[PDB]
């Protein structure tokens, strides 16, 4: 049946388990520490930089073509938030953590061997970002007592003026992917792995 439905129903438990980290529990209670939050953005910087490198590389893949959504890219939003927190963010002074490196390796290796599985990476990260952004930006601003419009670029999509319409269009796009039900199962298996890789980076904080 529907790939968007398969992924939603198939990853409901993984979404819940990704909050077993104390970083996320406190974030959900409205508690964040500046230093820890900034390291959390560093891990996402490396992840999205790699994912966007690989999605651009595979943009004309027949399966990925209909989910070519540069509107969702986060690398530049992350850089901007990193500059707000650090003043000047030097990547060589803040090299990727062990869990970040394993996540980037997964992205790279998937891109070169099974690029259709990058659909799982797009789903887990971007559809989550679009779904949670408005809520998470308010929680983060309140937790860190942030100035108006600063340090929350990661949660904002200036290229998308209708978030609700885009989320619907995204799920319709997932359902349009030219993949069979067996291939959708492989996309679900990858999505579960992505949730685990996110739990891995959260575990470090
Ligand atoms: C690893 C952490 C997380 C990942 C990978 C993630 C991923 C996702 C994904 C992929 C969806 C889309 C589900 C679907 O429509 O099929 C989603 C939905 C959602 N997520 Fe998360 N999520 C995470 C954590 C959080 C956190 C911390 C919040 C706190 C607000 C949150 C709030 C939501 C909400 C409210 C939705 C549903 C939005 C809607 O239906 O309008 N998530 N998430």
Residue numbers in the entry: 1 to 205
Could you share sentences copied from the article?
HOs catalyze the oxidative cleavage of heme to biliverdin, carbon monoxide, and ferrous iron, in a reaction that proceeds via a complex multistep mechanism. The HO enzyme present in L. interrogans (LepHO) is required for iron utilization when hemoglobin is the sole iron source and is an important virulence factor in the hamster model of infection. We also showed that the redox partner of LepHO is a ferredoxin-NADP+ reductase (LepFNR), a plastidic-type enzyme found in this bacterium. Hence, the catalytic heme degradation supported by LepHO and its cognate electron transfer partner enables L. interrogans cells to utilize iron from host heme and provide a mechanism for circumventing the iron-limitation conditions imposed by the host defense system.
